[PDB]
Amino acid sequence: FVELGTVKENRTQPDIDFRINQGVTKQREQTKVFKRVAGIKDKAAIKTLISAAYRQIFERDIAPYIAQNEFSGWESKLGNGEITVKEFIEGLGYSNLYLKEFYTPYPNTKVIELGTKHFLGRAPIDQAEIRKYNQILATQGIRAFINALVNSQEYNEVFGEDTVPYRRFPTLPAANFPNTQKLYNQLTKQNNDVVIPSFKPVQARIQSDKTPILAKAIADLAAQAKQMDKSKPLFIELGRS
Amino acid sequence: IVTKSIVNADAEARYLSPGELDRIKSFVAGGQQRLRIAQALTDNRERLVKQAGDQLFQKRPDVVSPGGNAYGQEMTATCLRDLDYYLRLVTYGIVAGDVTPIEEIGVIGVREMYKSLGTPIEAVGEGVRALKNAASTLLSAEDAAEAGSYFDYVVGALQ
Amino acid sequence: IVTKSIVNADAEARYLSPGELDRIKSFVAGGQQRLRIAQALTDNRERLVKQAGDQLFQKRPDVVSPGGNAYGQEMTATCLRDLDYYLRLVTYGIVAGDVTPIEEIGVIGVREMYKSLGTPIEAVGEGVRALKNAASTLLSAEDAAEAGSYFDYVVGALQ
Amino acid sequence: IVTKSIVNADAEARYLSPGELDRIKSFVAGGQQRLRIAQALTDNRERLVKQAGDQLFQKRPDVVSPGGNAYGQEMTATCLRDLDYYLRLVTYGIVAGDVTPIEEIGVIGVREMYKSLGTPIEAVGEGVRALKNAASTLLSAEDAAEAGSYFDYVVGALQ
Amino acid sequence: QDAITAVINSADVQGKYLDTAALEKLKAYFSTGELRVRAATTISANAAAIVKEAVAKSLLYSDITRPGGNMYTTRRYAACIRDLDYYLRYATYAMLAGDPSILDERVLNGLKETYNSLGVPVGATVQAIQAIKEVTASLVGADAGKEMGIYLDYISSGLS
Amino acid sequence: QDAITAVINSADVQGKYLDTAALEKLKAYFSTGELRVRAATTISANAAAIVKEAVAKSLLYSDITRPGGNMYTTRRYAACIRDLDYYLRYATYAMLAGDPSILDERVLNGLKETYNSLGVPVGATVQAIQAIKEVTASLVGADAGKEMGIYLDYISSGLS
Amino acid sequence: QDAITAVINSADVQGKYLDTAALEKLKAYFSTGELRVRAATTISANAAAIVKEAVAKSLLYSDITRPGGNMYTTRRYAACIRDLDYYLRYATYAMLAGDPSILDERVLNGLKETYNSLGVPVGATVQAIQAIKEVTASLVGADAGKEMGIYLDYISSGLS
Amino acid sequence: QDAITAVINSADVQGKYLDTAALEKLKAYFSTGELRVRAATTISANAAAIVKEAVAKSLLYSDITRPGGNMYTTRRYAACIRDLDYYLRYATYAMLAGDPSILDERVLNGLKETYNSLGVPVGATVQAIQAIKEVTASLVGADAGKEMGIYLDYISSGLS
Amino acid sequence: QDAITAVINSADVQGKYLDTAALEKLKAYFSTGELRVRAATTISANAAAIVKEAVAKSLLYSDITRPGGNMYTTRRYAACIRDLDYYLRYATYAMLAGDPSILDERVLNGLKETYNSLGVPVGATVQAIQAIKEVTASLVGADAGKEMGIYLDYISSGLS
Amino acid sequence: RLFKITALVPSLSRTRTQRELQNTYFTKLVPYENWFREQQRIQKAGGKIIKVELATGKQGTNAGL
Numbered sequence A: 001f002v003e004l005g006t007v008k009e010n011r012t013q014p015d016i017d018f019r020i021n022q023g024v025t026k027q028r029e030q031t032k033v034f035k036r037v038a039g040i041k042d043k044a045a046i047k048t049l050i051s052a053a054y055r056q057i058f059e060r061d062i063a064p065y066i067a068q069n070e071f072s073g074w075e076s077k078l079g080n081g082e083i084t085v086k087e088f089i090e091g092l093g094y095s096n097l098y099l100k101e102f103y104t105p106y107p108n109t110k111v112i113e114l115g116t117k118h119f120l121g122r123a124p125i126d127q128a129e130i131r132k133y134n135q136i137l138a139t140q141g142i143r144a145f146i147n148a149l150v151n152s153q154e155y156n157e158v159f160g161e162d163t164v165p166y167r168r169f170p171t172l173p174a175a176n177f178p179n180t181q182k183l184y185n186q187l188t189k190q191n192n193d194v195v196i197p198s199f200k201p202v203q204a205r206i207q208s209d210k211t212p213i214l215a216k217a218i219a220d221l222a223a224q225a226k227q228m229d230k231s232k233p234l235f236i237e238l239g240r241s
Numbered sequence B, C, D: 001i002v003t004k005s006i007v008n009a010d011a012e013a014r015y016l017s018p019g020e021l022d023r024i025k026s027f028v029a030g031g032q033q034r035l036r037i038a039q040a041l042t043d044n045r046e047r048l049v050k051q052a053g054d055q056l057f058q059k060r061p062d063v064v065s066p067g068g069n070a071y072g073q074e075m076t077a078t079c080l081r082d083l084d085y086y087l088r089l090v091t092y093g094i095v096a097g098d099v100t101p102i103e104e105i106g107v108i109g110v111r112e113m114y115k116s117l118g119t120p121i122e123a124v125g126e127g128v129r130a131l132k133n134a135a136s137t138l139l140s141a142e143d144a145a146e147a148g149s150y151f152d153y154v155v156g157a158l159q
Numbered sequence E, F, G, H, I: 001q002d003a004i005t006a007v008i009n010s011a012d013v014q015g016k017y018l019d020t021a022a023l024e025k026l027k028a029y030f031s032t033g034e035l036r037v038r039a040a041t042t043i044s045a046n047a048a049a050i051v052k053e054a055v056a057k058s059l060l061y062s063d064i065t066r067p068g069g070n071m072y073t074t075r076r077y078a079a080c081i082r083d084l085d086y087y088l089r090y091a092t093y094a095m096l097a098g099d100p101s102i103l104d105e106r107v108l109n110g111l112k113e114t115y116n117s118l119g120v121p122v123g124a125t126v127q128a129i130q131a132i133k134e135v136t137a138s139l140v141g142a143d144a145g146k147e148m149g150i151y152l153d154y155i156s157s158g159l160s
Numbered sequence J: 001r002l003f004k005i006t007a008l009v010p011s012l013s014r015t016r017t018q019r020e021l022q023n024t025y026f027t028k029l030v031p032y033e034n035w036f037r038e039q040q041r042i043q044k045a046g047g048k049i050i051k052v053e054l055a056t057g058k059q060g061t062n063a064g065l
């Protein structure tokens, strides 16, 4: 019983150092969520939430990037609490600062991925979810784009009204893991080139000739027509070529 | 426990607050007692697995019964190997001072694993309770308290 | 079922009455569903013997107990071989459509055989009931009904 | 099943797509068979609770044993009342055609309730399995299939 | 996409009306839909038993569940069960649709990228999908097991 | 909620099985579902024509669309069309469910608060919903127009 | 990761219990943690003074802060101070953990990509990290300055 | 807030140094902290047993768990167990802090609003908190049960 | 490259003369060269026996040599023996050089590209290299088997 | 144009074990074109809407919001 679970190999240094990271990255159980559960009379626990929000929705910081710092009314309405955290993230996304950091040097295709990385915490899932957001960036502003982004029932069923977004590691949809890792492994302002431009439609390698009792049915039923079909009188069924 | 405070102060933009430095200094002070407790549980492993299998198969005979999972010598050897694994993770948690490197390897997905293996989880919890009782008999009072700490975490986790 | 009607009309001096010809034509029509049910029970045999031994040794532990007959690996292997035999005869009765070629090989002298082997017949009936439950879980509703037909005949026969 | 399609098309800004109208028309057609199945399970309730308690206490005797929860007449009466509740919710799910009004009352928070009551959930799952077996014996084949549908949902939910 | 929707699309991009070959394809689909639905029902019956039997056939008692293997940690065992349940469920969807396009659209899109990123062994996954295919072809019969094995082998071939 | 779900709930909170009166209620619902579905289809046909005819009957050429009225600004005219489309759509949902609880849960919850906050005239809204009810009772027939007018009058009565 | 967590991982992937060499490693870490904590405290004291002295040693009065250099614009000077504060802070974290894996995971991951994308000079960054290392080795003492310079030279070597 | 932090705040808002009465308060807190910690440990031992015994004392076999009561649905029973676990846990926090301000800040802030919105019966909640208080005063002893019952009665009095 | 050439290069790119740490590295290499040469001689003795024992341990009597496997065709079996002989020979070269750069330059350069192009299973190759490592560590002793297993595990880790 | 809304969310699907007090009941300001989808989202969860109040805005004004 001290033999069913001992390895018989050695595992020296590169095999010792690769099986350490033999799965999903360590950042999953270490990205600590920020939740507004402190209370109204706290002026200290909300400071960490405000700086945390600037760290999530903006990539780096806002200290060496704006002169006369805004959001002071937003920080005040947060500390007093007539405004949830979700409306504070709204005010951050509305500001012309964020418009100058991410909308102005980047195209309309790339802003969809850079805008769903910040708010929803993950890359867009398939092509139709790029199409709807591109139409919203088509006949409406970004002030409606991030608006319809955050007001979906995916933001408010996952993050909730009083949490800041945190970096999600999604599993269930198609290629929603590796696009997100390709987005999040890159640092800020690292590659100007678009990470995922679109979703290339791939063709199948079986159309209908296989699936071989759909295919057996093609045959069996094609030959069903010319076997005597006894339902009507017999004399009409010897005179059919 | 240092990774806990580091990612805790890392989610914030602040440094490590010096109360966290005090708890790291205190853990650094208690590390020698932690190492002695871990070595005492290390060298006496087969006694602990023997007495755990003793108390478990006296407590729940259905794993012994042929409808249960641990029927036969091969399945009962796999059972005591599972108890050996959990004792090993308990020694890891005793050294690390906080239950992260033991939950990361033994807790975080155990319910669906044992569900798709057919074994009941309550019998595994009773096995870790038997390990806690045997290690409580093996150690002194202040050592058995600090071992029954992490054993208690595993027993609460498997339920 | 054709031998049944043939010896039935053969004891009489009359021919096969055309109602019997109707029942033979209907059995000839249902033979394809019979063959699919028999193949589905055929390819999944070891699952059915495993779950039957599971449910039986959970239900009656005296065969496991050393006073009972199926004590030890050799005797329990002979026990599961008996359950394999009865599953095989059930597939024969599923194909034949009537319980004659299964009663001729498994029923007609089974009580004195199991009496002079020492085994109880009620445990064998519970084993065929467990086979019926496992095949009911394996098949669809109209298939499990038609399988539980002949399984039900065996369970009534062993009692 | 109409609330399901309505909130399904209501999350979207679109109307009810006419394939959903086809499924509502088909459910409207099958509602008479649903009502007959529900009345047949309705009038024969005490038989089903009796046979479910029969098969459960034959299967798991620990609820009968004094360490278990259902020890004594009062606790065993509460146990059969729980089985009566689950049969009632199964009839609700049979009428509604979709498992929402039964999950809303019996499934959605059952694990923490039974955990803070001390009872095991696997014995409740075996009790609903016994209810499914007794109702399968009570009904015809196409009725037992459609009842074992929702009984199967409850058995999967309690695990 | 469906087989119906694929036939309609292939007739649409030409501007062609529904000719007799497309009607043959749709009538063959309407013939095979009986066993398609019955197979999907009995696969939805006992999916957990199929995944359990498949890991007991292929992955268990190897070095993969030993330390050093990719299924050693218990969260990785749970992720393995999740991936096999995904393969079986999407193969059920592709069997009932009669068209493997949903496998290409929802499963096989960025999956080799993920499995080479995480260091997941590909050959053990292929053998696990093979054991899934053998278990469900035994459980459902040969006649629907062929169509189940076609889409499971499609997942296995696209994975490799 | 449904009429089915309301019957199941009323039988559930007593612990009662499905007695014959509840089966009568469900069988009456299963009888009326035919014209329910046909009415919902033809109301989904031409909802824009119904809203256009209703504003042409009640609200147009009044002082409400003149300056000073609440429908003078063109965004307020678009908001008026939106509110009337909401009333017709949720009345269609309540007609097909056969239970007005979704009107109470999704429309009539905080609506008088909003209409007294914005200064929206309530009586003109009631007359517009009345004109909606007359137009759809003409369009669908009397037999389904009764059930449509029941939920539209429910919205009108809760609004007042 | 820690030094503790690295020792536990290296003992775990073999399935090995904690042998005496691992206990030696953990006891050496528990011996050195005293000066580790004291060094981290006094580096957290005056990080701004360290960064100021480092840019006054290496980067100031060069062509880099002249026009044409990469630190001419005042937002680029602020970004320079931010990057040096990052290097010092993450070197403090790696010093207190006793394991440079957090430098590899959080700093040195995609940093040469960024610095070659922006046109940031790499050699001036290496000399600035060198001046940081000299200033903090003077400030903290030689005995903890060795361990601080190990991780700062790790950042400098991975950057090059 | 603490008792320490409350004493420091009361000395701070006057600009007062720590006089002898504040030192008496802090030394009384440092005397009582022994049994405070021991009581918190044994309450953290068996919180589930305390909640189980409390619902078996007060809420079970009433009309509240019967149909029509507020604890009839099983999600409502789970929500009841959650609320009682919250009351016990925050009373443990207020006992170890020695100051009921965290009850006012985290529990008793908007709780009557919620319980009158949902239709939760308040008197049954007060009796359940009373049964919690009796069970934990029996379990921990009288000397720490007094301080536990002070904060549990604080929750009960603010709830009413 | 060598260990000597790597030490000379690391001293050269700084413009540094040979300091005492580099002389320590070269003298350690000149100490270990004895067993390096003896190990290389006895591995060059019976390389064919090592490859035969490794395929008999890992690859034989599996499904890989059965039809459908990648080693079914006899040219593919010969290519398998060729690849394993390559791994053993280049691991011998990297052991005698004391530097794994020739593995990175000559073996591990475009090898995953080739093995994913041909459909070669990677995990079976890793297990075959593992069996090679166990056989040669048994054959040469533990003291040189450590250094042989370091470069064979380097090939295995770069392959994955 | 902002509204002051007090609202409650049911949280029926799961048995949350955290604080989760802010979400069930809140008093927040929401802008003009945003309160529309907020209304709709609050009604999706079956939430009670207690009181809608004008914070910013004079009603009946056309230019200048």
Ligand SMILES: CCC1=C(C)/C(=C/C2=NC(=C\c3[nH]c(/C=C4\NC(=O)[C@H](C)[C@H]4CC)c(C)c3CCC(=O)O)/C(CCC(=O)O)=C2C)NC1=O
Binding pocket: A022, A023, A024, A025, A169, A170, A171, A172, A173, A174, A175, A177, E064, E070, E071, E075, E076, E077, E079, E080, E081, E083, E084, E086, E087, E090, E106, E107, E108, E111, E114, E118, E120, E121, E122, E124, E125, E128
């Ligand atoms: C619907 C199609 C689909 C698939 C398949 C999918 C897979 C997938 N498998 C993952 C991990 C994993 N996948 C496996 C699976 C395996 N490793 C093995 O050794 C076996 C050969 C194989 C199981 C048969 C394991 C062990 C992990 C754990 C890695 C980790 O999380 O540390 C991850 C990383 C994050 C997570 O599980 O939650 C994804 C996204 N996502 C999808 O959307």
Ligand SMILES: CCC1=C(C)/C(=C/C2=NC(=C\c3[nH]c(/C=C4\NC(=O)[C@H](C)[C@H]4CC)c(C)c3CCC(=O)O)/C(CCC(=O)O)=C2C)NC1=O
Binding pocket: A043, A073, A075, A076, A077, A079, A080
């Ligand atoms: C644009 C219009 C506008 C105003 C005015 C506004 C005020 C405002 N003043 C606040 C606090 C405060 N306001 C004051 C101000 C004063 N107390 C005094 O003794 C003086 C008489 C007076 C200064 C002249 C102080 C001292 C606080 C601190 C209370 C605290 O945070 O603990 C807060 C609480 C949260 C926070 O500051 O960040 C708000 C929201 N918000 C607004 O959106």
Ligand SMILES: CCC1=C(C)/C(=C/C2=NC(=C\c3[nH]c(/C=C4\NC(=O)[C@H](C)[C@H]4CC)c(C)c3CCC(=O)O)/C(CCC(=O)O)=C2C)NC1=O
Binding pocket: A004, A005, B056, B063, B068, B069, B070, B071, B075, B076, B078, B079, B080, B082, B083, B085, B086, B089, B105, B106, B110, B117, B118, B119, B120, B121, B123, B124, B127, E060, E061, E062, E065, E066, E067, E072, E073, E074
């Ligand atoms: C270190 C983290 C870790 C855990 C937790 C773990 C569990 C684990 N338990 C297993 C089997 C098993 N586990 C048990 C468990 C038990 N006997 C009982 O009756 C009780 C319920 C329980 C222990 C007292 C049994 C009986 C088997 C064999 C089951 C089978 O063969 O299907 C297996 C499959 C066989 C194997 O590869 O060992 C794994 C992977 N493995 C790990 O690497």
Ligand SMILES: CCC1=C(C)/C(=C/C2=NC(=C\c3[nH]c(/C=C4\NC(=O)[C@H](C)[C@H]4CC)c(C)c3CCC(=O)O)/C(CCC(=O)O)=C2C)NC1=O
Binding pocket: C056, C063, C068, C069, C070, C071, C075, C076, C078, C079, C080, C082, C083, C085, C086, C089, C105, C106, C110, C117, C118, C119, C120, C121, C123, C124, C127
């Ligand atoms: C196809 C028709 C057919 C039948 C029915 C049959 C029965 C049969 N059962 C036997 C033994 C046995 N049969 C059992 C039976 C059981 N285990 C139990 O506890 C239960 C009571 C029951 C099955 C679950 C046992 C335990 C033995 C070994 C008894 C002994 O060795 O004396 C033997 C003697 C050993 C042998 O040659 O296999 C025969 C011939 N053989 C046949 O060819």
Ligand SMILES: CCC1=C(C)/C(=C/C2=NC(=C\c3[nH]c(/C=C4\NC(=O)[C@H](C)[C@H]4CC)c(C)c3CCC(=O)O)/C(CCC(=O)O)=C2C)NC1=O
Binding pocket: D056, D063, D068, D069, D070, D071, D075, D076, D078, D079, D080, D082, D083, D085, D086, D089, D105, D106, D110, D117, D118, D119, D120, D121, D123, D124, D127, H060, H061, H065, H066, H072, H073, H074, H077
């Ligand atoms: C309709 C939705 C619904 C459910 C699910 C429900 C469960 C429920 N089960 C209870 C007790 C109980 N439930 C059981 C259960 C069992 N006996 C066993 O051994 C098995 C594990 C299981 C049934 C076969 C037992 C033994 C008790 C009494 C436990 C006690 O008194 O502490 C109680 C407390 C006593 C009561 O008020 O009836 C509730 C509320 N109540 C509901 O209104």
Ligand SMILES: CCC1=C(C)/C(=C/C2=NC(=C\c3[nH]c(/C=C4\NC(=O)[C@H](C)[C@H]4CC)c(C)c3CCC(=O)O)/C(CCC(=O)O)=C2C)NC1=O
Binding pocket: F064, F070, F071, F075, F076, F077, F079, F080, F081, F083, F084, F086, F087, F090, F106, F107, F108, F111, F114, F118, F120, F121, F122, F124, F125, F128, J032, J033, J035, J036, J039, J040
């Ligand atoms: C699903 C149930 C539901 C309703 C009804 C609803 C109504 C609603 N009507 C609004 C405005 C409005 N509503 C009206 C409607 C009217 N005024 C009149 O004079 C007529 C009597 C009446 C039209 C028949 C107008 C004119 C406005 C514009 C006020 C403004 O935005 O300046 C607003 C303010 C913000 C916005 O439209 O986008 C809401 C929320 N929201 C809902 O969720």
Ligand SMILES: CCC1=C(C)/C(=C/C2=NC(=C\c3[nH]c(/C=C4\NC(=O)[C@H](C)[C@H]4CC)c(C)c3CCC(=O)O)/C(CCC(=O)O)=C2C)NC1=O
Binding pocket: A060, A187, A188, A189, G064, G070, G071, G075, G076, G077, G079, G080, G081, G083, G084, G086, G087, G090, G106, G107, G108, G111, G114, G118, G120, G121, G122, G124, G125, G128
């Ligand atoms: C935690 C690890 C980490 C680092 C280091 C990091 C660096 C980093 N440095 C940047 C820019 C910069 N980095 C520098 C730094 C330098 N240029 C010089 O001439 C000097 C040699 C050197 C300072 C010592 C400068 C001048 C810029 C400004 C380029 C610009 O924004 O126009 C940017 C572009 C966007 C931004 O600052 O906000 C990133 C992401 N991000 C990280 O996450």
Ligand SMILES: CCC1=C(C)/C(=C/C2=NC(=C\c3[nH]c(/C=C4\NC(=O)[C@H](C)[C@H]4CC)c(C)c3CCC(=O)O)/C(CCC(=O)O)=C2C)NC1=O
Binding pocket: H064, H070, H071, H075, H076, H077, H079, H080, H081, H083, H084, H086, H087, H090, H106, H107, H108, H111, H114, H118, H120, H121, H122, H124, H125, H128, J009, J010, J011, J012, J015, J016, J019, J020, J021, J024
């Ligand atoms: C930390 C302080 C705190 C409390 C207490 C709190 C309570 C709280 N109790 C709730 C529901 C509930 N609360 C109760 C509790 C009771 N009803 C009774 O009959 C009993 C008298 C009493 C239990 C002792 C019940 C039965 C519900 C269910 C209502 C429903 O969800 O349908 C809800 C609605 C949503 C949800 O549970 O997840 C909240 C927010 N939140 C908090 O943040």
